[PDB]
């Protein structure tokens, strides 16, 4: 009834699609465990990109490492470690890493969005 | 609901001192709270040196990510200390608590379904 684990030890999944490149995703608390919302840890390699998209659920993010470029419906904004982000349902968003080192952020979504 | 995206330095949020029968030496920042969240809330807890969130249980789950320091986790049986970069999943009704046995502040993110408050 209590899981305690080092996030780094969760095997990351490489994501490479027409919309996502240079990203790896760790599912920390996924559908097997979560009654309501899931916890993922994304690592964005230098030059990695999560292109703009939207979805019917909200997203809650905490920036763990580095300088994250946040794509908005209009323009972009760069945030750093120690920022949180709340993405309303349906809001256009994406992410890019313009720096020379890896960026990490924690991403939580309601379980309807999958893990 | 509303549109948009909030992007904010967590330390810009005004902490609240927590003091209850079972909690001493703790402050909390509500990052994404009831006034905005459709489903679950995001808090940043700071445990001062010596601070204690004593063993308890509640009828919602908790999801934690340790941001800073060495967090002692109190379990139904015994305890375990974890560090920055660990996550914790606490099932509904599972006994849990936390202590800071170190001389510097420990920080962790804590998310709960909004039915449990903020
Ligand atoms: Cu149990
Ligand atoms: Cu998204
Ligand atoms: Cu609790």
UniProtKB/TrEMBL annotation, chain A:
Keyword Metal-binding applies: yes
Protein name: Cupin type-2 domain-containing protein
PTM sites of type Cysteine persulfide: 50
Modified residues (Cysteine sulfinic acid (-SO2H)): 107
Binding site for Fe(3+): 53, 55, 59, 93
UniProt binding sites for Cu(2+) 1: 53, 55, 59, 93
Lineage of the species this protein comes from: Bacteria, Thermotogati, Thermotogota, Thermotogae, Thermotogales
Residues the record lists as binding Mn(2+): 53, 55, 59, 93
InterPro entries: Cupin_2, RmlC-like_jellyroll, RmlC_Cupin_sf
A Pfam family it matches: Cupin_2
Residues annotated as binding Cu(2+) 4: 59, 93
UniProtKB/TrEMBL annotation, chain B:
Keyword tags: Metal-binding, Zinc
Cysteine persulfide modifications at: 53
Binding site for Cu(2+) 2: 56, 96
Binding site for Fe(3+): 56, 58, 62, 96
One Pfam family linked to the record: Cupin_2
Binding residues for Cu(2+) 3: 58, 96
Cupin type-2 domain boundaries: 44-111
Residue numbers binding Zn(2+): 56, 58, 62, 96
Residues the entry annotates as binding Mn(2+): 56, 58, 62, 96
GO molecular function: metal ion binding
Binding sites annotated in the UniProt record for Cu(2+) 5: 94
Gene3D superfamilies attached to this UniProt entry: Jelly Rolls
Amino acids binding Cu(2+) 1: 56, 58, 62, 96
Residue(s) carrying Cysteine sulfinic acid (-SO2H): 110
Positions annotated to bind Cu(2+) 4: 62, 96
UniProt name for this protein: Cupin type-2 domain-containing protein
Species of origin: Thermotoga maritima (strain ATCC 43589 / DSM 3109 / JCM 10099 / NBRC 100826 / MSB8)
